Every structure is written in C-alpha cells, then in structure tokens.
Design a protein around this ligand. Structure first.
Ligand SMILES: Cc1cc2nc3c(=O)[nH]c(=O)nc-3n(C[C@H](O)[C@H](O)[C@H](O)COP(=O)(O)O)c2cc1C
Length: 138
C-alpha cells in the first residue's frame, strides 16, 4: 500500500507514520511518500489511495503542492478506493468534509470515515494506528 501526504510542521507526517504502523502491524507493507516525491503512475496502480493533508489557509487543502496533486489525479481515479486523513487546528473539519465531497465527486469510493486529528496526534496516536488497521482490513 502507499500513503501520500503533505505536512507543514510534521503533524500530518506523524499521522502518516502511525497509519503505516497500523497497516504493518496487520501484517502488510506500505510506503509513506511525501507529496513532493510522489510518482503518479505508481500511485494509480494502488488498490487503495491513502491521502493526507492538514487544514490550510481558510479550511482548504494545501495550495502549492497537495492541491495540484489532487487536481492531477482527479480524472484517473473514478472507482478507486481512497482513505483520507489530516491534522487541523482551530476548525472542526470543514476542509476534510470538502476533501471527502471532492473525492466522491471524482468517482472515488471513500472507504472509511476520514481521520482528522487536532495538532500533533499525542493522545490520538492509537486512533491513527487503528485507522491504518481498518484500511488494511479492506
Ligand atoms: C497558514 C495556515 C492556515 C491554517 N488554516 C487552518 C484552518 O482553516 N483550519 C484549521 O483547523 N487549522 C488550520 N491551520 C492549522 C493546521 O491545520 C494545524 O496546525 C495542523 O496541525 C498542521 O498540520 P501539519 O504539520 O501536518 O501541517 C492552518 C495552519 C496554517 C499554517
């Protein structure tokens, strides 16, 4: 499996690492890839796209890297299974509600409830691991 994410301070990166840990604990392998290093062709071959990005600007996906990435894969993911996650601060998940609607609009099948964690995981570390385990069970 593959996890692709964007993180500005490391919070979403930490989530990605924990999600990977859950998948691995379930007995499977998974590679964690920063969005700037992603290879689209290899990504689109995946059974499940695990995508993460923190809340940016005013409740939107990060604009310089993650957003263009989503726009690029948008027309070649209809029917693809996807799982979404990200860290946020002061809001209550609007950016993620929009991210989910967006992916559904591209024809994707959102396999689990998107995982959103406030700031660094900390107490929510296990929640991140469990999300990975659910994805590994699909
Ligand atoms: C420029 C900027 C804008 C942000 N906009 C939002 C927002 O609209 N809603 C929210 O809840 N958090 C917002 N945040 C807070 C981040 O989502 C939060 O700090 C998160 O933990 C960062 O994760 P990261 O290290 O993976 O980037 C913003 C942070 C920055 C730097």
């Amino acid at each position: 499996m593959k996890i692709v994410y964007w993180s500005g301070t490391g919070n979403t990166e930490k989530m990605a690492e924990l999600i990977a840990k859950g998948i691995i604990e379930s007995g499977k392998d998974v590679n964690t890839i920063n969005v700037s290093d992603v290879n689209i062709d290899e990504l689109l071959n995946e059974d499940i796209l695990i995508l993460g990005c923190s809340a940016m600007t005013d409740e939107v996906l990060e604009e310089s890297e993650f957003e263009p990435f989503i726009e690029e894969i948008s027309t070649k993911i209809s029917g693809k299974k996807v799982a979404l996650f990200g860290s946020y601060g002061w809001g209550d998940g609007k950016w993620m509600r929009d991210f989910e609607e967006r992916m559904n609009g591209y024809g994707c099948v959102v396999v689990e409830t998107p995982l959103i964690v406030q700031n660094e995981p900390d107490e929510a570390e296990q929640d991140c691991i469990e999300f990975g385990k659910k994805i590994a069970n699909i």
